[PDB]
Structure formats: C-alpha cells, structure tokens
Amino acid sequence: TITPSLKGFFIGLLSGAVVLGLTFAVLIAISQIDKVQRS
Amino acid sequence: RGWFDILDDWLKRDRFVFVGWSGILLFPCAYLALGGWLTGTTFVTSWYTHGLASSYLEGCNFLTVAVSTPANSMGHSLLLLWGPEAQGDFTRWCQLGGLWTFIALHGAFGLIGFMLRQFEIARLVGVRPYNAIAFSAPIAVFVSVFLIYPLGQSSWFFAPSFGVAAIFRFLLFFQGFHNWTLNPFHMMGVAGVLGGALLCAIHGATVENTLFQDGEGASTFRAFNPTQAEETYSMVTANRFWSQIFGIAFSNKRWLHFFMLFVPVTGLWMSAIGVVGLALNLRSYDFISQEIRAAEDPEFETFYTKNLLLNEGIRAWMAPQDQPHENFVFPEEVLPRGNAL
Amino acid sequence: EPNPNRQPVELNRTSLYLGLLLILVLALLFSSYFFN
Amino acid sequence: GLPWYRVHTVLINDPGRLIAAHLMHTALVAGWAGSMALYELATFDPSDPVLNPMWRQGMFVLPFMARLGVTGSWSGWSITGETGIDPGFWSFEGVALAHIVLSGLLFLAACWHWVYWDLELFRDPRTGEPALDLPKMFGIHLFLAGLLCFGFGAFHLTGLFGPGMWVSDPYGLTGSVQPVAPEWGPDGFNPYNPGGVVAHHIAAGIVGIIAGLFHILVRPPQRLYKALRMGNIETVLSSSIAAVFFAAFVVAGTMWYGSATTPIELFGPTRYQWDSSYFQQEINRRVQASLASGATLEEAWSAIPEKLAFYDYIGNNPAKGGLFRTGPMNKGDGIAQAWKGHAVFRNKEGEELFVRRMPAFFESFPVILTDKNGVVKADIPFRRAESKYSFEQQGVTVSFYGGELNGQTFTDPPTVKSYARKAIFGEIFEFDTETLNSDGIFRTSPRGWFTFAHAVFALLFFFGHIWHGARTLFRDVFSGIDPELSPEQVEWGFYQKVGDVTTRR
Amino acid sequence: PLGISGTFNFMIVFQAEHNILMHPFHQLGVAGVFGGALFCAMHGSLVTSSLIRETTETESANYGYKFGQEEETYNIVAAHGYFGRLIFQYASFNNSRSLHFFLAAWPVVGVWFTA
Amino acid sequence: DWRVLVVLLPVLLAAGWAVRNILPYAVKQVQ
Amino acid sequence: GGRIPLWIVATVAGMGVIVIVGLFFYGAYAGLGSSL
Amino acid sequence: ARRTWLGDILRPLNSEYGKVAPGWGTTPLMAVFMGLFLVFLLIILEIYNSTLILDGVNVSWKA
Amino acid sequence: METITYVFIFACIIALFFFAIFFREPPRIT
Amino acid sequence: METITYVFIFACIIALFFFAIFFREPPRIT
Amino acid sequence: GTTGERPFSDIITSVRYWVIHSITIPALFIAGWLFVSTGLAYDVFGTPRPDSYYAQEQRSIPLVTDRFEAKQQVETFLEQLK
Amino acid sequence: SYPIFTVRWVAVHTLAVPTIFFLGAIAAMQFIQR
Amino acid sequence: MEVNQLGLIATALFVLVPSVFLIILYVQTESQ
Amino acid sequence: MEVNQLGLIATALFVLVPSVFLIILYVQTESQQ
Ligand code: CLA
Ligand code: CLA
Ligand code: CLA
Ligand code: CLA
Ligand code: CLA
Ligand SMILES: CC1=C(/C=C/C(C)=C/C=C/C(C)=C/C=C/C=C(C)/C=C/C=C(C)/C=C/C2=C(C)CCCC2(C)C)C(C)(C)CCC1
Ligand SMILES: CC1=C(/C=C/C(C)=C/C=C/C(C)=C/C=C/C=C(C)/C=C/C=C(C)/C=C/C2=C(C)CCCC2(C)C)C(C)(C)CCC1
Ligand SMILES: CCCCCCCCCCCCCCCCCC(=O)O
Ligand SMILES: CCCCCCCCCCCCCCCCCC(=O)O
Ligand SMILES: [Fe+2]
Structure with a gap:
C-alpha cells in the first residue's frame, strides 16, 4: 500500500536529488570550463 | 586530475567571496533562512497559529514583526511543505507555521556550513582553527534554545519566535515560568558575556x-x-x-588572547546547559528551605519570595493570550493582584 | 626497563591562583543550591 | 613540563599503556555498576509494585536489569510482586557481584599491561616504532560487535537461549519479561513495537558481521587514508565521540518520548501522557463501559485499578521536577498509600463540574471548575470582595467514587476546597509524608534524570568531537603556524587557488 | 538592592514600570555587550589562531611569548588573510590600532547608551 | 489572474534593458 | 568608468534612503498600525 | 621488545600499518551505502515524527 | 552551619586576593 | 551512610596494602 | 591585492552602470509595490486583509487545533466568512 | 580588462534585487487603510 | 533553616578535592 | 540508625586533611630527583 505521505515522501526525495543534481552539474560544468592554470 | 580535483580547484579559487566545498552547504542554507525570515516578517501572519498579526503587511513595525512558531497542535512536526499537514499547499504552509521550521532547519545547516567554512579556510591559509572552536558556543546556544528546548516541551509552539518583541516575550516567559534568573547556569552565562564585553x-x-x-x-x-x-x-x-x-x-600576550576566547565561549556553553535542563522543566525555581520557613512564618520575607509573587503574576496574566490553544478562562476574581493595582 | 614516554607535569603559581579562584567562586555560587 | 590538561597525552604512542588506561576505565565503570546496584538493593522497598514502584524510589540501574530479564532478589521477592521465587544465580545480587568481580579482574589486567608495556605486538616489524593498524582493528572490532549484536538479538531477546525483555500492555498495568519474536515488516520501525528491537539486532548484527569482514579484508583507499589521517589515532577519537554523541542524543530522545525499550513500569510515565490525558481517557472509557452494563457509579469507579489511577496524577509527570530538588519522588509528595477515589464535584443546581487540570508548565495553578461545556461555574477567588463563583456562593460539593472514600460526600466548603486543590493534579491519593519527611514538592522521575544527563553529555561531547577533530586535521600547526610563512599565501590574488603555491601569477 | 535576587527584583519591576525591553537604548546595551563578547571571542580566537610556532607540542604555547619581547607573537597578516576570506577582504582589519580602537569603542558606547 | 502579469511586467523590462546594454560586453566571455 | 563623481552618488543614495525611511515613520502614524 | 606466545599468534593482525588501496579504491561504493543509510535514517525519523505515515504502523503506545 | 560555610568561602577568596597581589610571580623583562 | 564509610575506609586499606607490597621502594644493596 | 574583479568604486561611478540601473531598480520597486496594491500578496501568503480576521459577529480567533486535519480547519474558517 | 559576470555579481544580485522588490512592497503598505 | 544536611559535605569536598589537586601539582613544580 | 549527623564530615576530613598533607610532601619529594 502506498500512502499519501509516502507519495509526499517520494516527492521530497526526488526534489532533493534534482536540486542536488543540478547544483553539481552546473558546478562541474563551470569548473571544467574555467580551469585554474599551473606552471 | 579527475573531475573531483578540477571541481576542488574552482571551489577553492581566490575570489571576492570564497566558496569552497563548505559553500555548497552554507550559501543556500543561509540565504534561505534569511529569505524565509524577511519574506515572513514582511508578508506572513501568525493569526491561525497564535492569534497574532506578525508582518508589515498587517501593520506591524520592525520591532513587532516575527516569523512565529507553529500551532501547538502540530507538535514537533517537521512541517515539510510536502508533508501531511500542508500537503504541498504553499499558502496553507505559511498559515500553519511552516516558515518557522523552514528557517530553523535551514539556519541550523547554515551554521554547520559556516563552521565548516572556518575549518576549510583555516586549513588552506595555514592557521590554527581556534576561530572555528569559538564558534561552537553560538552553535550550542542555537541548538539548545531553538531545538532541544522545544523538543522537551509539548511542541515547537514554545520555542522562540523569530522577532524582536517575540524574543522579549520569550525572556519574560522564562522569568515567570522557569525562574531562569535564579539558574546558576544562566548566571555563569551572564558572567561570561558581561565578562567578555569587559575584556573587549x-x-x-x-x-x-x-x-x-x-x-x-x-x-x-x-x-x-x-x-x-x-x-x-x-x-x-x-x-x-x-x-x-x-x-x-x-x-x-598569548595567555591574554586565549583568555579572551575562553571567557565568552565558556559563558555561552554554560547557559546552553541550563536551557537543556529547562527543556525538561528541570528548573532552579525554588529554595526549599526558604519555602518551608515562609509557609510557617508569615513575617519572613526576602527578595526571593518577592520575586516569586512577580512570577505568579506573569503566569496568570500572560497565559490565556500567550497559550491560546489551552482555552484558559480566568475570571477577574482569581487573578492575583496586590492592593489597588 | 624504563618507559620512554614519561613526561613531567607543571602548574605555575599564576595557574594555581587562577584555579583556586575558579573553584572558590564556583563553591560560593553552587553552595546555596546544595543546601537548598 | 606538560600542562595539567595534557597529562594523558603520554599514552598516544604507547599502545600497551593505552590498553592499561582503558582497562582501568572499564574496571571503574563495572565497579560503579556493582556499587550502584548494591546501594539500590540496600534501599529498595519491594513490598508494593502498585503505588511504590522502583521509579518512585529513585532507582536508576534497577530498571536496566529488570529491562533485560533480571527480576528477582536472592531474598525471594520479585519486582512483579511474586513471592517465593528462585532466581538462581542471576538475581540483582548476583548481577551486582559479577560486576565487582569483573572490576577486580580488570584492575589486575591493567597492572599487567602497564608494567609490561613493551610488547613486540605493538611495534611495526619493518621499522620498530610503535604502530597500530587501525583499519584492521576496526574490521576486527566491527566483526565482534556484529556477532554480539546478532547473538543478543537471536538468543537473548527471542528467548531461544535467554529470558527475553520487558514488555507490557499500552497502560503499563501488566508488564513482565517475555520472549519477543522479531517483527520483520515495516512496523519493526515503529519505536513502540518490541519485535522491531529483536529484528533490529538480528539484521544489523548480520550487516555488522559482513561489514566487519569487508573491513578486515579490504584496505582503505589512499585518498581516504590521507583525508581522514588514518595513521593517527586521534582520528578515531574524533569519529568515536561523534558516534557516541549521536547515540547519546537518540537514547535521550527515546527516553523522553517513550519507546518499547523505556517502558513506563520501570521509568515512569512520560510527560506526553499527561499532556494528552492518555490515562484519563482510558479510565473514562472503562467507566463508560461499566455504566453501559448498568453498574452504579460506585461500582464502575470501584473497578478502576489503583495502578491505572496512579498514572493519572501529575506527581508522576517527569516534567514537574526541579534541578536541585534531590532524591526519590517519595521525598516530594510522599510514599503513595491508597487511591482516595475519583472525586465528582457538583454545584447546588445538581450539575457536575470538572476541575481544570494543572498543565506541566505551572508551578502553581488556580482552581477553576467548568461544566461539560467549559463554562466557568466555580473557582477559588483571590480577591473576594466581588467574587461571583466562590464555592460558598455556588454550593459546590464533592462526592467520591471508588477508592478509600467511595460513597462519601463532603459539603463544608473548607473540605471541598482542599479536594479541589488536589484535583488539579488529577486523581487524589493518600500519601505517607512522615516516613521520609517529605517536603511536599514535586521531584522528577528517573526518566527525567536520565534524559537531562544524556542530553547534556551529548552536547558536551559535540565539543570534544570538534576539538579532537580539529587536532587531527591541524596537527602540523598545533604548536603554532610556520614562523617563515610567505605573505603571498595569505594576500589576495597572488595564487589562483587558495593555499596552493603551484597556481602562482 | 545590593544583592543577587534583589538585582532581579529591580529588573522585573523596571520592566513593568518602563518597557525597557522596548526601549532602543537598552537594545543598544544588548548590542553593546553581546557584540563586545562576540568581538572578544573573535579577537582572542584570531590572535590565538595565528600565534607563531615557538614551542613544541608538549609545552603550553604560552611559553612562546616572553614578557617585554620586542617582536609580535602572532602573524596579523595571516589573521587578516584567514578572516578576510571568511567574509571578504575589507570586512577585516589590517591595522591593529583601528582594530583595538574598535574593540574599546563598541561596548563602551553600548554601555553608555544603556546607562 | 491579470495580477500575476502586472507584478511581473516591469521586471521583464528590467532584464531587457540590462541585456541590451551589456549584450556586447557580455559576449567576449568566449575563450 | 569614473565619470560620475563618488560624492554625488553618495549624496543621492543617502537621500533616497532618507525618503524610504521617512516614509516608514510616516506610516507608523497613518493607516494600519497607527492605532487609529 | 618482549615477545610472548599471544604476541606471536596475534602478530599478523597488527602488521599492515600503512597499507592502502591505490587511488580512490572503494570510495564510490562507500558513497552508495551512505546514500542508502541516509534515505533509511530519514525514513525512521519521519515515521517517528508522524510526517511519514504508513499502513499498519501506529506510532503509539497502543502498539 | 550554612552561614559559616558561605562566610568561610568568602574569607578564603579575600586571602587569595592578598597572595595573588603581594605574592605573585613577578613579571620580568627577558 | 555510616556503613558506606566503614567499608570505604576498609577498602582503602586493602588498596594501600597492594601498593605497599608491589609498588614499594625496592631495597637495594648499598 | 586584487582577486581580479572590477572595483565597486569604478562601477558605481561608471555611466554604463547608471544607464542599466536607472531602469532595473525602479522596475523592481514598482513590481514590489504592485505585488501589494493589486492585493496579490494577501492571496499568495494567506494573510488576512483588515476585513477578514474575524467574522462580523465573532470574537474568537480561528486557531488550528488538529495536526492532520489542519489545512481543512483553516479552509473551514475562511468559508465561515462569506 | 575585467569580467562583469562573476560569482560576486551573483552574490550581490541575489540580495540586491529582492531587497528593492521588498522595499517597494513595504512602501505601498504605508498607504493601506483599515 | 531546614537546609539539606549533605549540602555541607558536598560543599566541603567540592572545594577540598580540586583545590588539593592544584596544590599538589604546584608544589611539585617548584621543587624542581 | 540515629547516628550523629556530623560524624560523616568529621570522618571525611579526618581522613582527607592529613592524607593530602602526606601526598603533597611525597610528590614534591619524588620530583626533586
Ligand atoms: C544546501 C542545500 C540544502 C539543504 C541542506 C536543505 C535542507 C532542507 N531543506 Mg531546503 N532547499 C534548498 C537547499 C537545501 N535545503 C534549495 C536550493 C531550495 C530551493 C528550491 C530549497 C527549498 C526548500 C523547501 C521549499 C523546503 C526545503 C526543506 C528542507 C528540509 C527537508 C530536506 C529533505 O527532506 O530533503 C529530502 C531529500 C534528500 C535528503 C535528498 C536525497 C538524495 C538521494 C536520493 C540520496 C539517496 C542515494 C541513492 C539511493 C544512491 C546514490 C548515491 C550517490 C552518492 C551517487 C531540510 C532542512 C523543507 C523544510 O524546511 O520543511 C520544513 C521545505 O519544505 N527546502
Ligand atoms: C528489518 C530490519 C530492521 C528493523 C526492523 C530495525 C528496527 C529499528 N532500527 Mg535498525 N537497522 C537495521 C535493520 C533493522 N532495524 C540495519 C540493517 C541497520 C544497519 C546496520 C540498522 C541501523 C540502525 C540505526 C543506526 C538505528 C536503527 C534504529 C532502529 C529502531 C528505529 C525506531 C527508533 O526508536 O528510532 C529512533 C532513531 C531515529 C529516529 C534516528 C535518529 C535521527 C536523528 C535525526 C539523528 C540525530 C542527528 C543529530 C546528531 C541530532 C542533533 C540534536 C538536535 C537536533 C536536538 C528500530 C528498533 C534506530 C534506533 O536504535 O533508535 C533507538 C537507530 O538509531 N537501526
Ligand atoms: C561481560 C559482559 C557483560 C554482561 C552480560 C553485562 C550485563 C549487564 N550490565 Mg554490565 N558491564 C560490563 C559487562 C557486562 N555487563 C562491562 C565490561 C562494563 C564496564 C564497561 C559494564 C558496565 C555496566 C554499567 C555501567 C551498567 C551495566 C548494566 C548492565 C545490565 C544491562 C545492560 C544494558 O542495558 O546494556 C545496554 C548497552 C547498550 C545499549 C550499548 C549498545 C551498544 C551501542 C549501541 C554501541 C554501538 C556501536 C557498535 C560498535 C556499532 C555496531 C554496528 C552494527 C551494525 C554491527 C546487564 C545486567 C547496567 C546495570 O543495571 O548495572 C547495574 C548499568 O548501568 N553494566
Ligand atoms: C547518568 C547519570 C546518573 C543519573 C541520571 C542518576 C540518577 C539518579 N540518581 Mg544516581 N548516581 C550517579 C549517576 C547518575 N544517577 C553516579 C555516578 C553516582 C555516584 C556518585 C550516583 C549516586 C547516587 C546516590 C547516592 C543517589 C542517587 C540517586 C539518584 C536519583 C536522584 C538524583 C538526584 O537527586 O540528582 C541531583 C542532581 C543534581 C543536584 C545535579 C548536580 C549537577 C551540578 C550542578 C554540577 C555541575 C556544575 C559544574 C561544577 C559546572 C562547572 C563549569 C566549568 C566546567 C566551567 C536519580 C534517579 C538518589 C536516589 O534516589 O537513589 C536511591 C541517591 O540517593 N544516585
Ligand atoms: C572518549 C572520550 C575522550 C577521551 C579519551 C579524551 C582524551 C583526551 N582529551 Mg578530550 N575531550 C572529550 C572526550 C575525550 N577526550 C570531551 C567529551 C571533551 C569536551 C568537553 C574533550 C575536550 C578536550 C580538550 C579541550 C582537551 C582534551 C584533551 C585530551 C587529551 C588530554 C586529556 C587530559 O590529560 O586530561 C587531564 C584532565 C585532568 C587531569 C582533570 C580533568 C577534570 C575534569 C574537568 C572533570 C573530571 C570529570 C570526572 C572525573 C567524571 C568523569 C566524567 C565522565 C563520567 C563522563 C586526551 C587525549 C586535551 C588535548 O588535546 O591535549 C593536547 C585538551 O586540551 N579534550
Ligand atoms: C522563503 C522561501 C523561499 C525563498 C525566499 C527568499 C530567497 C526570499 C528573499 C528575500 C529577500 C532577500 C528579501 C530582502 C529584504 C530586504 C529588505 C526589506 C531590506 C530593508 C532594508 C532597510 C530598511 C535598510 C535601511 C537602513 C536602516 C534600517 C538603518 C541603517 C540605514 C539603512 C538605510 C541601511 C523559496 C523561494 C525557496 C520558496 C519557499 C519559501
Ligand atoms: C581487587 C580484586 C577483587 C575485588 C574488587 C573490588 C573490591 C572492586 C570494587 C570496585 C568498586 C567499588 C568501584 C567503584 C567505583 C565507582 C566509581 C567509578 C565512581 C565514579 C563516580 C563518578 C564519576 C561521579 C561523578 C559525579 C559526581 C561525583 C557528582 C555528580 C556528577 C557526577 C555524576 C558526574 C576481587 C576479589 C573481585 C578479585 C580479585 C581482585
Ligand atoms: C503529495 C505532496 C504534496 C505535493 C508536493 C509538492 C511540493 C513540492 C515542493 C518541493 C520543493 C523542493 C525542496 C527540497 C529541495 C532541497 C532538499 C535537500 O537538498 O535536502
Ligand atoms: C543459574 C540459573 C541461570 C543459568 C545461568 C546461565 C549461564 C550464564 C548466562 C549469561 C550470558 C551472558 C552472555 C553475554 C555474552 C558476552 C560474552 C563475552 O563477552 O565473553
Ligand atoms: Fe589584542
């Protein structure tokens, strides 16, 4: 049985992972572009 | 030179506003605690949870605005936006107190972020981390006052509300119900804060x-x-x-500046301990030897018994409006009052 | 077969004065509550 | 020399004397357990598990023995009120004694490892310096913790080989020690399902056995060994405190809110049972039933067990206490002796009134009686000159049903008033105040004292985690910063990445 | 009153008769002493963090400062570097004299206002 | 209704006149 | 880049805050919150 | 130092001081179990909190 | 007994002051 | 309280015997 | 030293800056004003307007008294108002 | 030669632009009548 | 005043024990 | 039993004060050598 708050639980679970996903994709992207230079 | 080492390189760039790995936790959580408070003191009421106006929109000024705590009937619910109380309905979330837990918990993780930032920057610059250590006292205050204290009581209703005058109400509550000025853990706290200002x-x-x-x-x-x-x-x-x-x-000179960290830090830690006790109503309310004599000897008066009459006034005069879910009805005739006043 | 990790311990006069004062003031503070 | 707050650091590169210190600490803790249990047996009154249970008597360790199945004294009593029982060796006295004996043996082992500190086992075969391979130790200890945890769950709690655990009905009337079957479903996570405790330890135990084997067999990666400084034992101290304060908060939490492991018959009620009139509801439901089967009021209140009514009393609320109000609860309101009966209050019009109960926040509380609707109908006034609701004006009476006073009715306002002042506390009981010279002021229960101490220790241990954590990660500058530290590393814009000198210009 | 509880009696009755909590000068007093404790912990912790290594791990670092020594025992450039990055570079002091005048001035003015 | 549209109308005229006056100085961010 | 002198932005900035803030004290006496 | 019988039996368990898996070894897999543990602690907390309500689970004494 | 205890502890602190001031470690310049 | 005192003192004497025998000043010839 | 960015002294005195922000700052101020004057802030956040704290003949506050039926309690007070 | 879109840019505009929105919102509230 | 009898022993030892600790450490510092 | 209330503190100090005196003297002896 899937209850309303389990449906709510999953929503928040999936919202959190999406937020976290984006943040780190943006940040890996930016960091691959604007690379620090060493000599 | 993985994607990790390259991400690490960018987070740890010298820029106007250092980011770091700790930034991923700090800047979102600080910003949302902040934004939640400004948003809520500006547009959100406390009508359905406390019977109170609490925003500019409703005519409150800077001193009287607050993000108030949730109703007592929510208990200690996380009060998530998708949880079973609001059910994803944002407007009803605001009406139910959701911004309070929202600020309380994002701010809690914002403080972790800040402490981690002090460790992170300390490590890169090559300095000992005593500033992170000092920051443990603010964290201990926040946790004991905004989290542990309500967790020991019936609900978050009784935690502090996020406002200037809301906090004053909390002060006075603590006087009349907890006799908190009499608590040696608060007294140590005062000594370390006043002592710190003295040292400054x-x-x-x-x-x-x-x-x-x-x-x-x-x-x-x-x-x-x-x-x-x-x-x-x-x-x-x-x-x-x-x-x-x-x-x-x-x-x-080294002992001097260590003494300067030690005093106020130790002060706040001690006060936090006392509030943990008050989570449980484990108060220093009374002196038993004075009560025994006072009961027997109607001529024995001290400043202790006088202050307890004042607390008895605070409790009965403030309770019906302060704790409205109780539906306290106190006729005039039961209200403690001195002569004339 | 002596143990190489032994170290001497110190407490200078000023630390005694600080410590003695801490304890005395803590006693003055908490005694009223011990008697109750 | 060493400052006083550093004296114990002489153990850091001395694994043998570290074991010795650790044995002495264990010797002391086991010794305390035994001492505490003996003092508690010297002072425990077993003659009344109804109105004088262990939690009224300031008994702290007695309920942890009772919790896992030790219930009887060699003197023949049991905490369930049975007489003439044979506990065998594992009575409270035998448990106390095993811990003293264990303490003494650990004391001797401590002397041996202190004197013979220079064992070859502790030297790195390569280099001959003291070395401890902590990843392997963790794996070993984890494996062991897993076996114990599995075995505690599979044999002790199930009663397959062992006594089970304390279990009770929802109102703490009929507790006892029973084998408990594991709850493998989702209710196993219901903190009030004792089966979940059994299932927890079987499964977690297996998980530990597996995890310990993995940690015995697989070395930590270089990245992690460097980041967490795994060659430094203070790293283990730092994470160990962290887990300890996490655990300390959880057991404070579950002790304050209640759970299947903190039952009300060993630790007292929770404050939430008073908040929600939990026991009052159940008492009333029983009265409503009895009256359905057409019993008199007297008959239906006469049927409420005293144990149940005792729970409906604010003097057993653990949030009624004080930090320096010391000792057993019996030192406060007294040794409870009898239910006086349920008090029914009536005004001159025949209508029944209800004393408004004291909420836990309030050291003192006015006496206010309302009707079934919550309209104020009587009070005890402060200023009398304009009182409308006085007991004298409203002809308030009190009649008792059940208890010592069953069938009695009092009409003289002085008497009615005193029962009304007790009724803000819930059900009214007869107390012996003479025996302990009780002073009349509420104490907290062991549930309160336990929670206060563990919450406080958990907070302090957070500070030690931060402290030892920072000493692990900043060991290189513990005595100070580099006396010849480049100003280019701390001025802005010299290095593109902070702290890294290879990013210059 | 000259007494511990008498001081509290005084504070409670003052609040009844004047709403000192709602008075901006008492709000400045709180800012003065909270802030003074803050800047006390800050300054202590920041000088402490940037003590130059002069000692081993077995001695109090306090033995690295000698009474009257001419040199400073901490790297203020390091402390500014740490604290400038914790916030931003100009929120942090680079001038001990400004820094210590700030420490004197803030609580003193606060307490003037509350007095 | 119409209200969600007026409270957001002036804000788009803000992002246009700051994109059209920083459209060139924004594009050299190229390599 | 530098064409508008700093002291003039300051003066202007300062007066706009003086207006918003003054507006708020006005509102203390009129409308919601004025007690009237 | 001093050899002993128990010493010699236990010797190999305390002999790999400093041995490490190259590089990142099992870190990715560690991260996964942590992820699951989180999710699962989150579930235990929200059941206790009555934010997650499940059929047949009655978080009350009346269990 | 309680009055004596309070006064005893206060008395000791005042002694401590005397030694702390007149019998301090003297600060010296090297 | 009297019982605990007697057993405490007795137990300290036993501890002392242990230290006096096994952690004595070793007697050394000249 | 300079972490790299353009100084604030130089931006806020630059004409280009005031071209851009002559427009943006008042547009946000005006959007914020409209947010309240259209009455939209009340409906987003559930804040009573001055006429909607109490029904006409009532003096009791609409306090939420149940955790899980709570959003339904509030909906109910809002209808006992039309 | 400076960039104009920086982390700092985002930083200041993440506070700056809601602050103005909010201020004009609060300006309007001074003209609400009961 | 009906104070708590064990208050006296608690205050006595609270002072005595840690004070003695410091004195022992201080004295053995001077004698070297 | 109805024992003298001050027997306890009399006993505690009778043990503590002389014992502590000897311990002070011994420890500062040991750290001369
Ligand atoms: C810095 C990050 C951050 C953090 C730490 C938080 C933290 C929190 N927020 Mg906030 N939030 C954030 C950013 C953040 N937020 C942002 C950017 C926004 C704007 C959209 C919001 C908007 C927001 C709202 C509107 C609300 C919160 C709420 C909350 C709380 C509930 C969180 C929750 O249940 O997540 C659950 C989700 C997770 C824990 C993520 C799990 C991720 C995966 C699935 C792990 C599983 C691993 C997988 C199985 C294996 C893969 C392993 C992997 C390593 C490869 C919590 C206090 C709520 C609150 O305060 O309620 C009172 C709330 O209502 N947040
Ligand atoms: C079917 C298998 C099964 C079953 C039925 C259970 C059943 C249970 N587990 Mg076990 N578990 C299992 C397998 C299983 N487990 C396995 C395989 C593992 C991995 C080894 C675990 C690991 C595990 C842990 C680590 C814990 C449990 C706990 C529990 C209990 C949860 C109820 C409770 O009181 O939670 C209460 C506990 C929580 C709600 C978690 C606390 C969450 C808070 C937020 C953390 C605190 C954070 C922060 C430090 C606090 C700051 C303080 C401030 C906020 C106030 C229950 C007996 C919990 C327990 O023992 O409780 C006593 C617990 O802590 N389980
Ligand atoms: C030789 C074995 C042994 C046995 C059978 C007992 C038995 C008992 N002791 Mg004794 N005890 C022992 C050794 C033993 N003790 C030792 C060596 C000491 C000194 C350290 C003590 C100190 C001691 C004290 C101080 C007390 C007892 C008490 C008790 C009773 C209750 C125990 C209890 O509630 O534990 C509960 C224990 C726990 C909840 C700890 C669980 C472990 C936590 C969760 C750590 C988890 C970390 C782990 C590594 C993670 C694993 C992960 C997993 C996935 C694998 C019981 C009669 C109590 C009593 O009544 O005494 C009079 C009491 O207060 N004992
Ligand atoms: C986890 C710890 C714990 C807990 C919860 C309990 C709980 C309990 N014990 Mg047990 N007890 C313990 C440890 C514990 N004990 C230990 C270790 C001992 C040996 C000393 C005893 C010895 C003992 C005896 C002899 C008796 C009890 C009794 C009791 C009960 C009454 C408690 C009471 O009045 O407290 C009073 C508590 C206080 C007044 C709190 C004092 C804390 C002060 C404020 C010190 C902290 C200040 C500090 C100096 C600050 C410095 C700051 C600086 C760092 C800067 C209660 C159930 C009594 C009982 O009824 O048993 C039958 C009883 O007679 N216990
Ligand atoms: C498992 C727990 C644990 C362990 C093994 C250690 C071990 C250590 N700590 Mg850490 N520490 C811990 C917990 C722990 N700590 C916690 C919880 C805190 C926060 C309060 C700290 C805070 C802390 C600081 C701030 C420092 C240490 C230092 C040290 C080292 C020297 C300690 C010493 O010589 O004390 C000597 C202590 C004394 C001679 C007397 C102490 C008297 C105390 C105040 C009261 C006694 C309590 C009493 C006996 C009852 C026991 C309490 C128990 C029931 C919980 C040693 C490695 C020091 C260090 O890094 O050295 C470099 C240091 O500066 N610790
Ligand atoms: C909550 C939430 C969220 C978020 C939000 C946010 C983020 C917000 C923000 C907001 C903001 C960010 C705001 C701001 C505000 C501001 C203002 C309101 C200001 C004011 C100011 C002032 C008033 C000042 C003035 C002055 C004074 C007072 C004194 C001195 C001088 C001067 C002039 C400076 C989200 C989305 C997730 C959703 C959910 C919920
Ligand atoms: C040798 C030997 C023996 C014997 C043994 C014995 C005799 C033991 C005992 C032991 C014991 C008898 C022990 C005890 C101990 C105890 C302890 C360990 C304690 C602790 C405590 C504490 C720690 C406290 C603290 C506190 C206080 C004081 C106040 C309040 C607060 C607190 C709680 C914190 C035998 C024959 C067997 C065998 C052979 C050998
Ligand atoms: C059935 C439940 C009601 C409908 C659900 C709609 C609610 C959607 C709101 C989601 C907002 C995302 C906030 C969580 C993001 C941050 C979480 C984290 O990083 O820890
Ligand atoms: C005498 C009547 C009862 C029968 C005696 C039963 C025998 C003893 C049972 C005690 C079991 C405790 C086992 C705990 C496991 C710990 C093992 C270990 O640490 O070495
Ligand atoms: Fe200084």
Missing part, C-alpha cells in the same frame, strides 16, 4: 593608551604598518599600570 573594552582601551609614538601626527592610526615586526604598544607599561591600579595585570 579593557583590552582595546589599554592598547590604544599604551601605543608607542611611531609617527608624528595626532591621528595615531597611520603609524602602524601591518608588516612591521615590532609591538605597536608597550606590554611593559600597560602591565605596570594595571599592576598598580587593579593589583594584577596580564604579562603574557
């Missing part, structure tokens, strides 16, 4: 009035070069001055 003033003033003449101008701030080797004031003359004025003096 006395040290700052001592250095400003034992400076060496390192320049020829009347404004003495220009005669200091941030890379000079030499002390800019005289430990020796300061020392002799306080020895002869107050009896003893510092003689060790």
